Design an enzyme around this catalytic site. Structure first.
Site, PDB file in Angstrom:
ATOM      1  N   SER A 199      15.332  12.981  10.862  1.00  0.00           N
ATOM      2  CA  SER A 199      14.082  12.650  10.022  1.00  0.00           C
ATOM      3  C   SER A 199      12.936  13.759  10.291  1.00  0.00           C
ATOM      4  O   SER A 199      13.255  14.941  10.191  1.00  0.00           O
ATOM      5  CB  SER A 199      13.513  11.170  10.301  1.00  0.00           C
ATOM      6  OG  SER A 199      12.323  10.973   9.645  1.00  0.00           O
ATOM      7  N   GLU A 326      20.374   7.781   1.710  1.00  0.00           N
ATOM      8  CA  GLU A 326      19.150   8.187   2.390  1.00  0.00           C
ATOM      9  C   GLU A 326      17.911   7.419   1.932  1.00  0.00           C
ATOM     10  O   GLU A 326      16.949   7.331   2.697  1.00  0.00           O
ATOM     11  CB  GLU A 326      18.909   9.691   2.211  1.00  0.00           C
ATOM     12  CG  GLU A 326      19.913  10.564   2.925  1.00  0.00           C
ATOM     13  CD  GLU A 326      19.491  10.854   4.359  1.00  0.00           C
ATOM     14  OE1 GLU A 326      18.487  10.245   4.811  1.00  0.00           O
ATOM     15  OE2 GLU A 326      20.172  11.668   5.036  1.00  0.00           O
ATOM     16  N   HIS A 439      19.164   5.772   6.373  1.00  0.00           N
ATOM     17  CA  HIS A 439      18.427   6.768   7.144  1.00  0.00           C
ATOM     18  C   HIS A 439      18.373   6.421   8.630  1.00  0.00           C
ATOM     19  O   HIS A 439      17.781   5.412   9.040  1.00  0.00           O
ATOM     20  CB  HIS A 439      17.016   6.923   6.556  1.00  0.00           C
ATOM     21  CG  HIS A 439      16.294   8.143   7.022  1.00  0.00           C
ATOM     22  ND1 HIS A 439      16.253   9.315   6.293  1.00  0.00           N
ATOM     23  CD2 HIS A 439      15.554   8.368   8.132  1.00  0.00           C
ATOM     24  CE1 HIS A 439      15.542  10.219   6.948  1.00  0.00           C
ATOM     25  NE2 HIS A 439      15.097   9.666   8.061  1.00  0.00           N
TER      26      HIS A 439
HETATM   27 ZN   LIG Z   1      13.167   5.795  11.401  1.00  0.00          ZN
END
Ligand SMILES: [Zn+2]
Ligand SMILES: *[C@@H]1O[C@H](CO[C@@H]2O[C@@H](C)[C@@H](O)[C@@H](O)[C@@H]2O)[C@@H](O[C@@H]2O[C@H](CO)[C@@H](O)[C@H](O)[C@H]2NC(C)=O)[C@H](O)[C@H]1NC(C)=O
Ligand SMILES: *[C@@H]1O[C@H](CO[C@@H]2O[C@@H](C)[C@@H](O)[C@@H](O)[C@@H]2O)[C@@H](O[C@@H]2O[C@H](CO)[C@@H](O)[C@H](O)[C@H]2NC(C)=O)[C@H](O)[C@H]1NC(C)=O
Ligand SMILES: CC(=O)N[C@H]1[C@H]([C@H](O)[C@H](O)CO)O[C@@](O[C@@H]2[C@@H](O)[C@H](O)O[C@H](CO)[C@@H]2O)(C(=O)O)C[C@@H]1O
Ligand SMILES: *[C@@H]1O[C@H](CO)[C@@H](O[C@@H]2O[C@H](CO)[C@@H](O)[C@H](O)[C@H]2NC(C)=O)[C@H](O)[C@H]1NC(C)=O
Ligand SMILES: O=C(C[n+]1ccccc1)NNCc1cc(C(O)O)nc(-c2ccccc2)n1
Ligand SMILES: [Cl-]
Ligand SMILES: [Cl-]
Ligand SMILES: [Cl-]
Ligand SMILES: [Cl-]
Ligand SMILES: [Cl-]
Ligand SMILES: [Cl-]
Ligand SMILES: [Cl-]
Ligand SMILES: [Cl-]
Ligand SMILES: [Cl-]
Ligand SMILES: [Cl-]
Ligand SMILES: [Cl-]
Ligand SMILES: [Cl-]
Ligand SMILES: [Cl-]
Ligand SMILES: [Cl-]
Ligand SMILES: [Cl-]
Ligand SMILES: [Cl-]
Ligand SMILES: [Cl-]
Ligand SMILES: [Cl-]
Ligand SMILES: [Cl-]
Ligand SMILES: [Cl-]
Ligand SMILES: [Cl-]
Ligand SMILES: [Cl-]
Ligand SMILES: [Cl-]
Ligand SMILES: [Cl-]
Ligand SMILES: [Cl-]
Ligand SMILES: [Cl-]
Ligand SMILES: [Cl-]
Ligand SMILES: [Cl-]
Ligand SMILES: [Cl-]
Ligand SMILES: [Cl-]
Ligand SMILES: [Cl-]
Ligand SMILES: [Mg+2]
Ligand SMILES: [Mg+2]
Ligand SMILES: [Mg+2]
Ligand SMILES: [Mg+2]
Ligand SMILES: [Mg+2]
Ligand SMILES: [Mg+2]
Ligand SMILES: [Mg+2]
Ligand SMILES: [Mg+2]
Ligand SMILES: [Mg+2]
Ligand SMILES: [Mg+2]
Ligand SMILES: [Mg+2]
Ligand SMILES: [Mg+2]
Ligand SMILES: [Mg+2]
Ligand SMILES: [Mg+2]
Ligand SMILES: [Zn+2]
Ligand SMILES: [Zn+2]
Ligand SMILES: [Zn+2]
Ligand SMILES: [Zn+2]
Lengths: 535, 533
Positions: A199, A326, A439
Site C-alpha cells: 500500500s 484491489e 488489499h
Molecule cells: Zn490497510
C-alpha cells in the site's frame, strides 16, 4: 545465549531469542534511531539519536506513532488486525532487526520492510509483520521501522522551515541510513539492501526510487499494491497548504501568519489533531487521505509522473504486483449501500454516486466517461455487476493502473522488472466473500505467517507461503525471484513494456499471463488525462 | 391473354408474364407516376402524371435516374451489380408492380421496396430487386419505384421556392400516393402496405416514419442496414446551401433564384461529374446531396423526432449484416483493396480513423482510437483491419440502427431485430470483407431460386425462409408463424433485453445486444464529448 548482545554505533543493545517451528531467530526490537519528535520537534524532520550509555532494552516492541484508530467494525478481526497493537506516542521513532539464529558468517542480504496504511496509520509492531519466519527460512536479515503518519508525518506548509513536509519520508530515510551504518553488526550486507512495502509502503519505496539522496541506501525494490504515481499518493503544494491551514482553523488557531500558525498546532494535544484530520479532505471520497507526501521540490523534485518518465533506472531490479480485488475493501468505507455484512447489491443510483466518491474531483464529463466505460450496457441494472464494477473502478484508478504505468516506464528505461498478481484467498480470511482477494491479504503469505503453530492455515497454504518467501528471498539475493537454475517447468519471465508478462501467484503453479488490465488502463493512463486537460 | 391488360386511374397498361420455377407471375414495369421532372421542373417537387390515351407499354424497366456510375473496379460483379442497367435520364419517375399470375381475388398485402445507394445512386431495375420470386412464393404484391438521386433529388437552397430540398423524398411519397389509389387494380390491399428498403432506402423509410404526411400511406416498416438518424443521412440547412453553392461555382454559375436558373441550364451529365467534388473533407461514408432538415418534410432533426415520437400502432422489422463496414473501406481508406488482404499499418489505421469518422475534434478521434485499439496487440495489422471495419460499421450503421430501435420499442412500437450472418457462396468480394453491406438483399428477394444463378440447394431453402419471415411480417406484423409454437421463436426487440435473432443457415438463434457495449460510446458518450469540447 551470547548472540543476543550486539553493539551499534550509538551504544549497546540487549536482544531476545524468538521461537519458530523450524528453529530459532534472534531479534532486536525497538532500537531508537531518532531523537523523539516531540513538542517543538513535531512537524520537523528527524534528528539522529544521540548516543547512549548503558544497554538498551531492545527486547520488546516500542510505541506506535499517533494515528486514527478504525472504529468501523468493533472487534472485527479484519479491521482490528491493522489497528495499533501497542500504546500510541509521538515517541515512536524506533526500528527492528531480525537475523538468523547463528549470525551468518558471511555478509547476507538485507530486506527492509515499509508498512502501509495510506500514510495515516500503520506500525512495524503488527503481528502480520513478524519477521521471524522469513528470517528463519531464507536466512536473510530483515529490518522494519516506524515512521510518523497523518499530520505528524506529512502536514506541510510548503516553504516554512516549520512544517517542511514529508518528514515521515525523512523518518524512513534516516532508518535506511541507520541500516547502512549498523546492519553489518547483525551479519547483513550494506551493499545488498532490498526495500519492500505494501500500500503506501509500496508508494514509499517508489518515492525512494525517485529521490536521489535515498538511491544510494538500497539496490533493489519491491512494490506490492502501491505506486508513487497513484492519484492518492501525492499532493500539490497549494493543496498541502490549504489542507494544513484548514486543520489549524478546524482546531482553532487565531491571532508572521505562518510561523505563528504552527506554534498553535504545536500546542494542541495529539488526539485533537487526529480527530479533525479527516474533515480537511476536499470532497467526500474513498481511497483519499488528508496528509500525504507533498511535491515540494526537495524530497520530490517534480511530480512522480514526471520523475518516472525520465529517471535513472538502468540496472535497477524491481519486483512489482497487485492482488486480484484491489478496490473492494475501500468500498465499505464510503460507497453508498456497502457493508461487510450484506451482499452489497447496490442500485444504478448508488453506483453512479459511488463513482463520484471513487473518482473524486474530476470534471462532470470525466465522471460520465467512467460511468459509461464501466457499465455493462447489456445488464446495466444488475446489482451484482454494478458492485463488482465499482470495485474495478476504485481498484484500477488507485492501484492497478498506476502500478502498471510504473512497470512499463521502468522497463522502458532499462530496469529488470518482475510482476505478479496475487490471487489466492486465505481460508482464515474474515472479510465477506464478495470482497475477493482484498488489499493487503498477500502480506501474511509473504511473511510466512502460515507457519505459525497458532493460526489455522492449510497444508496447501504452508507450502505456498514457503514458495512465496523463496521468491522474495531469491529476489533480494539476486535481483531475480526465479528459482535459480530450475528445470522444473514454471519459469517467471520479466515484465517488458511490449509483451507485459506477469505471473499469477496462487495455489496452482505460476501461470504466465499478458497484460495487467491492459485495455482498462489505456482509459486511465492515456485517455482520461486528455479529457482533464483539454476540457 | 386478358390478364396483362389493366386500367389504373390515368389510363390503360399492358404488362408481361415472368416465368418462375414455381409458376408464372404478371408484372407491370415502368408505370409513369409523375410528369417528367425536366427543364424548369428540375429540383422541384414531383407533379402527378396526367392521364394518357392508348395503352402504356409496361413490359420492361424504364430509365435510371441520372447518377454517378462507379468505376473503382471496372467489370467486377461486386461493384457492377449496383450500377445502372438502363439508360440514364431525367425522364425517370416510373414505378413497377408484380402480382400473382392468377390475380388475387382477395385483397392481399403490399410490399413496397425503396432502393438504397447513399442518396446518390440506385435503380429499381437492378437484378437483385427482381420482385418475381417474392410474389410467386408468398403471393403478395410488390411495388418499387425510382426516385431522383444526387443533386437532382436533394440539392437544396433551403428556403427558396426554386430548390427546396428533399424532392427525392417527395418522389417516394408521391409513388406511395399512387399505390393508395391504384394498387387495388392489381389485387393489392391498400390497407396492408409495408415499406422496406436497404442502406439509404432504409433511411428513407425512417424519414417516412417521421413525416406526418407520409404516415398514412403505409402501416408497417422494415429498415435494413440504415436509419434516418445516421451520420450520413441528413445535412443541416447551412451545410446544404454551402454545398449547392459550391457545385454552382464548380460548374460556372454566377441571389438564389439566379443560381438555380443557371444550374437548370446545364446538361445533367455535367452536374453528375462534379458531385463528389463538393464534400468538405476526405471521407468514406459521406455523400454530397442528402435529405436536409428544412422544416417542411422533417419538422426537426431525425433524432429529435425519434426522441419525442409516439409509435403505438407501428410494427418495425430492423436489422444489419455481420460486417457493415468492410465494403466502404476500399473507397478511400489508406491501404485497403479487394485484391490483397488489406493488412494495414498502425499509422494507416490512425489515418483511416480520420477519414472514417470525418469532421470531429482531435480529442474525439483520439477517443475513437483508444476505444478501438487492442492494447495487447496495438500493431497487429489483421486486428487493425477489423477494427477499422468496426469503426465505420458501428458509427454509420449499427449504432444508429440500434439507437432507433430502442426508442421505437420504448415508445410504443413492436420491434423485431436480426443480424444477417450468411456469406453468399457466390460472393465476388474477397473473404476478409465477411458479410458486406447490402449482401442480404439477394436472399430477401429470393434470387437463389433463379435457376441460372448457381446457389446452393441449402442456400435456396435459406432464401425461402427469409421470404416467409418477411411476408409474415408484412401480413401481420409478426415474423413468426401463427400456428407453430414449436418453431424457433423470434422474440421482439426491447430496450432492456435487446434480443435479436441471427439469420444464417442454422435455425433461429437468439442473442442479446446489437453491439451494446460498442454502441454506448457512439450513441451516448461521443455526443457529450463534442458538446463539452
Ligand atoms: Zn490497510
Ligand atoms: C447493506 O448495508 C448498508 C449499511 O446500512 C446499515 O449499516 C449499519 C450501521 C446498520 O444500521 C444496518 O442496519 C445496515 O447494514 C445499507 O445502506 C443503508 O441503508 C439505510 C436504510 O436502508 C440508510 O439509512 C443508510 O443511509 C444506507 N447507507 C448508505 C446509503 O450508505 C444497504 O442498504 C444494505 N443493503 C441491504 C440491506 O440489502
Ligand atoms: C494492398 O493494396 C493497397 C492498394 O493498392 C492496390 O492494390 C495492390 C495489389 C497494388 O497493385 C496497387 O497498385 C493497387 O492500386 C496498397 O496501397 C497502395 O500502395 C501504393 C504504393 O505506391 C500507393 O500508391 C496507393 O495509394 C496505396 N493505396 C491506398 C488505398 O493507400 C497496399 O500497400 C497493399 N499492401 C498492403 C500490405 O496493404
Ligand atoms: C529539511 C529537509 O527538507 N531535508 C533535510 C533532510 C533531513 O536532514 C533528514 O534528517 C534526512 O533523514 O536531509 C537532507 O540531506 C541529507 C544530509 O543532511 C545527510 O547528512 O546525509 C543524507 C544522505 O542521504 C542527505 O543527503 C535530505 O535527505 O534531503 C537535506 C535536508 O537537511
Ligand atoms: C434574384 O434576382 C432575380 C432577377 O433575375 C429576381 O427575380 C425577380 O422576379 C421578378 C418577378 O417576381 C421579375 O420582375 C424579375 O425576374 C426579377 N426582378 C428583378 C428586379 O431582378 C429575384 O427576386 C432575386 N432572388 C431573390 C431576391 O431571392
Ligand atoms: O454503396 C455502393 C453500392 N451499393 C449500393 C446499395 C447497396 C450496397 C452497395 N457503392 N458506394 C460507393 C462509394 C462510396 C464512397 C464513400 O465515400 O462512401 N465513395 C465512393 C466514391 C466514388 C467515386 C469517387 C470517390 C468516391 N463510392
Ligand atoms: Cl530506547
Ligand atoms: Cl513548543
Ligand atoms: Cl524502557
Ligand atoms: Cl553463514
Ligand atoms: Cl542503484
Ligand atoms: Cl503523478
Ligand atoms: Cl493549487
Ligand atoms: Cl501547486
Ligand atoms: Cl512567518
Ligand atoms: Cl498530547
Ligand atoms: Cl547482471
Ligand atoms: Cl486482475
Ligand atoms: Cl439487467
Ligand atoms: Cl459475464
Ligand atoms: Cl516450486
Ligand atoms: Cl494471457
Ligand atoms: Cl488485458
Ligand atoms: Cl425473364
Ligand atoms: Cl405518354
Ligand atoms: Cl384511348
Ligand atoms: Cl386468392
Ligand atoms: Cl405533400
Ligand atoms: Cl439525426
Ligand atoms: Cl451540418
Ligand atoms: Cl464536365
Ligand atoms: Cl470522381
Ligand atoms: Cl498510438
Ligand atoms: Cl480540434
Ligand atoms: Cl403491443
Ligand atoms: Cl447443392
Ligand atoms: Cl455487445
Ligand atoms: Mg496544488
Ligand atoms: Mg504553497
Ligand atoms: Mg468555518
Ligand atoms: Mg465540470
Ligand atoms: Mg440508463
Ligand atoms: Mg488473516
Ligand atoms: Mg482489461
Ligand atoms: Mg396520385
Ligand atoms: Mg452552419
Ligand atoms: Mg475555383
Ligand atoms: Mg502507441
Ligand atoms: Mg442505444
Ligand atoms: Mg453475389
Ligand atoms: Mg409471435
Ligand atoms: Zn467509453
Ligand atoms: Zn540495457
Ligand atoms: Zn470542371
Ligand atoms: Zn475508451
Amino acid at each position: 545465549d551470547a548472540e543476543l548482545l550486539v553493539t551499534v554505533r550509538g551504544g549497546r543493545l540487549r536482544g531476545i531469542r524468538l521461537k519458530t517451528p523450524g528453529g530459532p531467530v534472534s531479534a532486536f526490537l525497538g532500537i531508537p534511531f531518532a531523537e523523539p519528535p516531540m513538542g517543538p520537534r513535531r512537524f520537523l524532520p528527524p534528528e539522529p539519536k544521540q548516543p547512549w550509555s548503558g544497554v538498551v532494552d531492545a527486547t520488546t516492541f516500542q510505541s506506535v506513532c499517533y494515528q486514527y484508530v478504525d472504529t468501523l467494525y468493533p472487534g472485527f478481526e479484519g479491521t482490528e488486525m491493522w489497528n495499533p497493537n501497542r500504546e500510541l506516542s509521538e515517541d515512536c521513532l524506533y526500528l527492528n532487526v531480525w537475523t538468523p539464529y547463528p549470525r551468518p558468517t558471511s555478509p547476507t542480504p538485507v530486506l527492509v520492510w515499509i508498512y502501509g496504511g495510506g500514510f495515516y496509520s500503520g506500525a512495524s509492531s503488527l503481528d502480520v509483520y513478524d519477521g521471524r519466519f522469513l528470517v528463519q527460512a531464507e536466512r536473510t536479515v530483515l529490518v522494519s521501522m516506524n515512521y510518523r503518519v497523518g499530520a505528524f508525518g506529512f502536514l506541510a506548509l510548503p516553504g516554512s522551515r516549520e512544517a517542511p513536509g514529508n518528514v515521515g519520508l525523512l523518518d524512513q530515510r534516516l532508518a535506511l541510513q541507520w541500516v547502512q551504518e549498523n546492519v553489518a553488526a547483525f551479519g547483513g550486507d550494506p551493499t545488498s539492501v532490498t526495500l519492500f512495502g505494501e500500500s503506501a509502503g509500496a508508494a514509499s519505496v517508489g518515492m525512494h526510487l525517485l529521490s536521489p539522496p535515498s538511491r544510494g541506501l538500497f539496490h533493489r525494490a519491491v512494490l506490492q499494491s502501491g505506486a508513487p504515481n497513484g492519484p492518492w499518493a501525492t499532493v500539490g503544494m497549494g493543496e498541502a497548504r490549504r489542507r494544513a491551514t484548514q486543520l489549524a482553523h478546524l482546531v482553532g488557531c487565531p491571532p508572521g501568519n505562518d510561523t505563528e500558525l504552527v506554534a498553535c498546532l504545536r500546542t494542541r494535544p495529539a488526539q485533537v489533531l487526529v480527530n479533525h484530520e479527516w474533515h480537511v479532505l476536499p470532497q467526500e471520497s474513498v481511497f483519499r487521505f488528508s496528509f500525504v507526501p507533498v511535491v515540494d521540490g526537495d524530497f520530490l523534485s517534480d511530480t512522480p509522473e514526471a520523475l518516472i518518465n525520465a529517471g535513472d533506472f538502468h540496472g535497477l531490479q524491481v519486483l512489482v504486483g497487485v492482488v486480484k480485488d484491489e478496490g473492494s475493501y475501500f468500498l465499505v468505507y464510503g460507497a453508498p449501500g456497502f457493508s461487510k455484512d450484506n451482499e452489497s447489491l447496490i442500485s444504478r443510483a448508488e453506483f453512479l454516486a459511488g463513482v463520484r466518491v471513487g473518482v473524486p474531483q474530476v470534471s462532470d464529463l470525466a465522471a460520465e466517461a467512467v460511468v459509461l466505460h464501466y457499465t455493462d450496457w447489456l445488464h446495466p441494472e444488475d446489482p451484482a455487476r454494478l458492485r463488482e464494477a465499482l470495485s474495478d473502478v476504485v481498484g484500477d484508478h488507485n492501484v492497478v493502473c498506476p502500478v502498471a504505468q510504473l512497470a512499463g516506464r521502468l522497463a522502458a528505461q532499462g530496469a529488470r522488472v518482475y510482476a505478479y498478481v496475487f490471487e489466492h484467498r486465505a481460508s482464515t480470511l474474515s472479510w465477506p466473500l464478495w470482497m475477493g482477494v482484498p488489499h493487503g491479504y498477500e502480506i501474511e503469505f509473504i511473511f510466512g505467517i502460515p507457519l505459525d503453530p497458532s493460526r489455522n492455515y492449510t497444508a496447501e497454504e504452508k507450502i505456498f507461503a514457503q514458495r512465496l518467501m523463496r521468491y522474495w528471498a531469491n529476489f533480494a539475493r539476486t535481483g531475480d525471484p526465479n528459482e535459480p537454475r530450475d528445470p522444473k517447468a514454471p519459469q517467471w519471465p520479466p515484465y517488458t513494456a511490449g509483451a507485459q508478462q506477469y505471473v499469477s501467484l496462487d495455489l496452482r503453479p505460476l501461470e504466465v499471463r499478458r497484460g495487467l488490465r491492459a485495455q482498462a488502463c489505456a482509459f486511465w493512463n492515456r485517455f482520461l488525462p486528455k479529457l482533464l486537460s483539454a476540457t
